[PDB]
Amino acid sequence: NLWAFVFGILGNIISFVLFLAPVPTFVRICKKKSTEGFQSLPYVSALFNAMLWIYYAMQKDGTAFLLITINAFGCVIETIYIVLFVSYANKKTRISTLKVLGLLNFLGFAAIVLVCELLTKGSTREKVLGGICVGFSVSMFAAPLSIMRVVVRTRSVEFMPFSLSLFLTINAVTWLFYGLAIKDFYVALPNVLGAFLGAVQMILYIIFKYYKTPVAQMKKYTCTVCGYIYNPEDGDPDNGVNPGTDFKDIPDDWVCPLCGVGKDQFEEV
């Protein structure tokens, strides 16, 4: 049907973009000739997921062509990210990555093919594969949930840029509507989860972006006995007050580092 086509094209465009999201990261990694502190799990994952979904679609044949084309392109692009990463990786990390690549992507996937080609056909095949795709896709939500957890725990949104959230959300509702059009609730349900979590991400961003007060706008205070000036940007490290500390967040048993008088003797500049 026409609808499924519109949402297929849309889904492909948006998801294409999201597949090109790690590119600056890899421009970096190619610069430094090191994978730095980056992990290969998102990539090994994204590839395994893409493969599972291609496999799922080949069972649905005709309608689901559009959820192959994107996943197909996934397989390539992720395969690229994996190669580069393994090129510029630590020996230790190189081997970690290769091991997970052999377990999940080669063996795991092969076992899945083996179990599906010889234990199911037809509808039972659809249900098995679908169940597995839903399961894995859902499991991949651990990374964004982790990110959310960090954002709330840290009251910052540095690790969670707004546009990634937006694009993930739009991707989610697009493939949701897509699943609805081909009446496939294996494609649709985890996109419900995804759209929900994305919305919650945008909400968290709007809430926590300007939570902490910028060190710049923090107020200087002065000891009216010493003349001493407290710089929040400088803080008072030698006496257990890390730089960037606000004056009001300083423990009330703190004193003027020069004069030695109480905090009550201080007044804003």
Q: Which parts of this chain interact with ligand DCM (CB under 6 A)?
A: 15, 18-19, 46, 53, 67, 70-71, 137, 171, 175, 187, 190-191
- Residues facing residue 167 across a β-bridge: none
From the CB of 230, what's the least distance to ligand DCM, in Å? 48
d(CA 21, CA 36): 18
Q: Please answer whether residues 129 and 59 qualify as being in contact, where contact means their C-beta atoms are separated by less than 8 angstroms.
A: yes
Q: For residues 53 and 205, which CB has a smaller minimum distance to ligand DCM in the complex?
A: 53
Q: For residues 78 and 236, which CB has a smaller minimum distance to ligand DCM in the complex?
A: 78
The residue sitting closest to ligand DCM, measured at its beta carbon, is: 18
Q: For residues 197 and 255, which CB has a smaller minimum distance to ligand DCM in the complex?
A: 197
From the CB of 44, what's the least distance to ligand DCM, in Å? 13
From the CB of 86, what's the least distance to ligand DCM, in Å? 20
Q: For residues 146 and 154, which CB has a smaller minimum distance to ligand DCM in the complex?
A: 146
From the CB of 181, what's the least distance to ligand DCM, in Å? 12
Q: What φ, ψ does residue 268 adopt, rounded to 5°?
A: -60, 145
Q: Please answer whether residues 209 and 157 qualify as being in contact, where contact means their C-beta atoms are separated by less than 8 angstroms.
A: yes
Other Cβ atoms less than 10 A from the Cβ of 261: the count is 15
Helix residue spans in 88-184 (DSSP H): 91-100, 109-119, 122-139, 142-154, 162-181
From the CB of 48, what's the least distance to ligand DCM, in Å? 11
Q: For residues 169 and 245, which CB has a smaller minimum distance to ligand DCM in the complex?
A: 169
d(CA 135, CA 86): 27
- In this structure, what DSSP letter does residue 25 have? H
